[model samples]
Target chain A: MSAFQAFVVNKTETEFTAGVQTISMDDLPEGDVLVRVHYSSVNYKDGLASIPDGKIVKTXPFVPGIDLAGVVVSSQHPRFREGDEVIATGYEIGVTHFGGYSEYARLHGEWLVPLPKGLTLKEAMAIGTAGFTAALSIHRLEEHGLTPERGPVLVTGATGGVGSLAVSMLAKRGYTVEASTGKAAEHDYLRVLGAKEVLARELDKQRWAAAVDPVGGRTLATVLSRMRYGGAVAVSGLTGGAEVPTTVHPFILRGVSLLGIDSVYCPMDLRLRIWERLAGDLKPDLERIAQEISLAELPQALKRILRGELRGRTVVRLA
Target chain B: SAFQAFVVNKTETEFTAGVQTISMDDLPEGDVLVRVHYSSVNYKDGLASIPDGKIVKTXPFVPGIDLAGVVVSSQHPEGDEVIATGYEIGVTHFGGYSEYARLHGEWLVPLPKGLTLKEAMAIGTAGFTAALSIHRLEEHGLTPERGPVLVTGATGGVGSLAVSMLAKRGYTVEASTGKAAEHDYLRVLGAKEVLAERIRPLDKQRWAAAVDPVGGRTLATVLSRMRYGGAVAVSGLTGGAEVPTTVHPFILRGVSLLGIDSVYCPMDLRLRIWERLAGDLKPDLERIAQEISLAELPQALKRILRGELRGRTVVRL
Candidate 1:
């Protein structure tokens, strides 16, 4: 019924730019529910969605915020109702669909997860897509038989959002966490987030029962070589690079498993289950990892993230 | 006491493997003395019998990786039925190619309840390897409801047994083989579908799990088409050893390539798998078994090496 300000990315034949614009509810896509946005988060994927050649946004004039938490304003779907709190992440959000960098959003009812008991809208954004990916990786490794008793677990890209959250959650669950990063000066920050050991990006000969890797290049190859017998590695990103040159020796000789985790298209059932765990057992100490920002500040934050200069999660307070 | 054995000897430039009479004292060093009654033929055994096969390290060797018999004298008892396999039994120590053999007790498993010595050897290393593959795949989260399971080398010992065991566990099995004549045979072994052995790298995401005894490019092909979260248990290299593959299957589909080394498998898992083979995962032995005597091993060994041997060949000692 009223106009609002939202960040939109547009692309022309030779130039691309992202900026804030005035928009009305009529511009929102048709969906089963309308949500009054409270908080959204910046993930590496959101940064990708804002760039012209990032290959994330399939169309121009895209609204980019892959993670959103809010209260439902109206709903045509029976399962969700007006006045209900909800969170939505992944599955074409901020890619092909108009996403959460706005005052309000219209979304498919199936895409909305009723905010679980333990998390507030702000806290949920703090634990956003990045945290969810980390939790999913840990969950999969556990499913593949990783245990704290088996040995220490490795978290690569440790000062970043996923790696930091993974370290905290894993340490809370009683695991000895080994953090690998290029940021040597941030070792104290990592220790505060529950990392037991911090090392430079090139891992040594220490055997690990499991590893959470967002940095995929030669770093992934290093992690594979260091896994103990029957160990697993959950790879969710290739920020370091994509081509992973590895031998079959680790897989065959040690019974190791490499599990690829695509959070964007993660099945709905598992997605909801992961969110529930994030509110419960997988909840990390978000105070040290999340910084509260405003919608007007997103473009600068996106540039910072693109340069790999940000330390942890950035929550955009929309209300 | 004296007994007959199949021994390989090299005295000069020439090498030969044949039957000979040898006393109990002539046996190589080991922990338990066994009175061998049954053994089975595998592709490795065929390799061990040949001079250039490169499987056996030394001359004057015995070649039989699968053995089922009674313990004559050991820590357990004098008449305990036992099964021994893998752990350098055929390659280094004296193996089941003899009427009497000495073996490491640690490599021995007490015959599981549901199987006789004859039945145990009928399943042997090949069938047991299949059981181990399926067990590990199940442990990695494979379920019948996920989708059809594929068995490469479907008419061979490991593949045939994998087909039956997966089918018995309520999975739909797709058998892949070069043998067009054995389609009906595969179906009888519980294959719901039979595919041509040669396939493209990325056909369709059809299988939830694949039991691959035929490695090389076939393994590569299986890897490409595995469903999301699927696993491929690689055991043999009858097709070839080197696997030329890409990482797309693993990184995109969340598929896993699980290696099966029955030779060096830890004893705990080996014993558990043997029990499963005797109980739930047992194949219809009457169909898979082709009984032969010790004298028939040479010819059977050659046939297996040539990839012409169908099912399994159980050698009665």
Candidate 2:
């Protein structure tokens, strides 16, 4: 058995702390394939998992990174080979089992996705769970008949990981993108990523064909009211808050559809389709969205993300 | 030219609606003139004839929302058979209550092939709304293989027609109606099962989709019981209009609530639905149509308002 370092979080009655530690390959839970984690990305959920009261991690000690891109070192599954690159995200990975914050992880074959042709291990994590979620949202919206000719699409919380990638991908798909961001200084940053217009947190009367919302709460209500007739909104996150005090008028009067996007526990066929799209049409320029970091810098990044100060994606490299 | 009409007029103290002889030239305003051969009586027609119905704003109003007949004169060929319903036809303008009626050319649909004028009125607005709801639900990914579909107010016009149409489309239909006597009637209309119990807000997920005319608490209950990725098509307020529901169903189950308004429905879709009703989407319409003459319409209207009417009433104008 080989030894490697990983970021481990332990909780006591008074406090919660996460830092680097040495663990062997035997430390990972038994599974069909063992991967040497090449890269992982920071998401808001990872931030919540690191804190004492975040309520994400149920156990006392854990390694928390929901997304991992790696190469298989050994495999019991016929689908994967020793040199094959793969990705694993969602479905009890970080919360219940050892995750991508480590140098090695053993995961079930069912949780593994073959790396598509267009993306590398590092680039896959750069897209990560956040970008996958954004892609899924767009896929759902399009399924509900959202098209470029329909109207402009809106992306809320547009400077964050999901929001920024959604804006770039939507603009790439030829949609007129209107982005809502709380960060006044990030308007230019959003424009560079292909936002046709940027607004403050509140939405104006302008109607959208669809909206990709990560910021829930009152913003959801505002977006709902402004959507054009027969429009839809794909909601995946609740970064703003959980309580959505919305009325049924928008639904009944205008025939608007509200589609929920849960990337976690997504069906395997759909998960593979989304990744294939990420490698194809939905892929956005990663240079502006990904911010590279090392394992030693994760704690500070986690604090910044929890405080809602971090902009764009934070990808951690641990080859 | 002369015609017969059902006219509703009101004064400060008394309000009344009755049949009368009128001139065809008395039609308020329109582009095309149709010699209405058939019309249908709906719940709105019942409401329009009553003093406190609150459906009509002006006196001497014609109170039918659906009409199908031959075009007497229009930009189209002179004798082209046509259909016109909704879009202020019976609400504010002269409607199908007359032996002869005039309508806007824009509101008129050339009788689609395979349907007679009498058959068109037999289906009427209620059946059209049901078809539109099904069309929209299918657009939202509801399919026969998903699961059973629920039809609330199953004995009523919209609900019964929706059940028949969904069943014809190969769906298993579970019908809910308050009347126990209507169970056999619902089954005859192609319902696989009938639910006579009062619906609770949250039941076991039983339906993949629903066609709901009974709003209020029933809508809330139906919303909660839909399967993941299910859709509910809402049209009328036979129960109540205020839908007191939470976001849990939409966010957790990915359910969709699609509203259906036949009155102001876009003409392109209206024509398409009518064409579909003529073809593959056609239900067994004769069983639902209870025929009457223009002279018998007043009593039918009164019985409809009193909630004593069953099935649909087609007026042979």
Candidate 3:
């Protein structure tokens, strides 16, 4: 039986174990397409899956990686073929199924996105789930009648993977971007991504035309209170807190919209279009964003991601 | 130059709302002198008529946020049958409560083919707000096939008209209200289901979209129970202003809260909304609006604030 190596995590009544381990092809759960995972990216979900009490994984002793880029090894599915490049993100991937943390991942054909013209396997992982979330945020705001001419677009969590790319993509789209971050030292890094970071109110004055928010709660409350008339804010994560204290004043009186952006369970039609955009107009500068690591280097990287110390993206080379 | 208007004046000690003979010179700065034929009452108009309702910027103000009339005099040209609504019409400026109004020419929309001056007033600001809410929800990818749409405050002006409009557009509608007696009233407006409320932060997913004019706990409840990828078009605060909501629905279920503000609505979209109202969006105004004379407006306005009102009330000039 053919064998592969993967980043695996195990939990029991008293013991918790995790690290790279070798397993046979028979170890994988059934799927239509068998992919030779080329690269995987580190995310907060991946970090949570690595620990025993994190509670993200459906079952333990499972492979952990929410974002993967790979080549089709073999397929029973009609859509995928051997040697074809594919990318998959957040469809019960790392959580329930064996994910991109491995040298091989067997997955559904329907879950795969064929690598578009302008992106590569390494590039796809660089712009994985975080980048997709950022791109989707921008697309939703634009769909809701936002434009570059409206005013400055705010990107909160500016040092995080999603926020960093969002700032770049918005700048590339010609929007005046203002960013917010807790880290005061990330100023130069933020400026290169095309945003002015403010480490900073409610109803103070109308400023942002729109915003891309990953930090929820009070940050969300203040952003809503300051959005210009007809502005929209795309909310994706609640890294700060869950309870968002806001009023009907900005919504009713200003006509602003609060758009809830979710990368998981996103419609496939929209998912495909956003991938196309990531390869085109919404593409961020990946050379600066991608930080490379290997299978053995993954454990420390996952810890760094969970500790909130990593910047941009940390992509693990699988094969 | 002398025209009578329904006026509300207030001071520290007392408050009064009544009809008074006012000169044309008292009108706010504008270029279109309209001979008002029909005007309608809205929640904002009721607020302006009260002592500390916090709507009017100045006292002795005319409070009819919606008006459809004939332009007797004008500088920038448009139509004879026209409308002057929203954009400080009722609060800081003398509004449609007057028999004559000098209004900004740019804000006027010529009566679209399928509606009359009286019918337009019958629709007025309440129905206009409802129409805009529907428009925004539709823009947010809402369709009849998506699932059932919930209309909160289903017997009130915005809610009642929204129910009618959504039904006409072939949507399966579910309406909610505090008044249990209005279940039949909502059913006549074409609501398939009439609900009371939900208290949990997250509950069983039900509605695909909602048109909520009553913000507060009702809005919070609506947000908590939206189906995956659903949307809510919220425009008012009659229920209350504070919306206690968590990010779980937004980030996890992919729900959207689209805000609708007809007062500062863009002229470009405002015209299109009027066109739809006169065309396909025209609801059964005979059922939705009850007519009154200018002299009957004061009591009607007071009743609205006390939650003793439902549907639309149009005042004839």
Tell me which residue pairs clash in candidate 1. none
Model 3 accuracy (lDDT, Cα): 0.83
* Local lDDT at A54 for model 3: 67
Which residue pairs of candidate 3 clash?
Answer: none
- Per-candidate TM-score against the hidden true structure: 0.51, 0.51, 0.51
How accurately is candidate 2 docked according to DockQ? 0.01
lDDT of 2: 0.83
DockQ of every candidate: 0.01, 0.01, 0.11
Residue B295 lDDT, candidate 1, scale 0-100: 87
Docking class of 1: incorrect
Model 1 ranges off by over 4 Å: A203-206, A240-242, B1-317
State the lDDT of candidate 2 residue by residue for B1-317, as single tens digits.
77789989898898767888888667887668788888998888787777667678877778898988877777643788888878888687778899888777878888999998888887888888889999999999989899999988576778778988998899999998766689898888899999741111225587999888755335555765678899888886542124345667677888888888988999889888988999877888867778999899999998877678777779988
How big is the positional error of residue B117 in model 3, measured in Å on the Cα after superposition? 70
Most lDDT-accurate candidate: 1
Backbone clash count, each prediction separately = 0, 0, 0
The interface root-mean-square deviation of each model, in the order shown, is 14.5, 14.9, 11.4
Q: Enumerate residue pairs that collide in model 2.
A: none
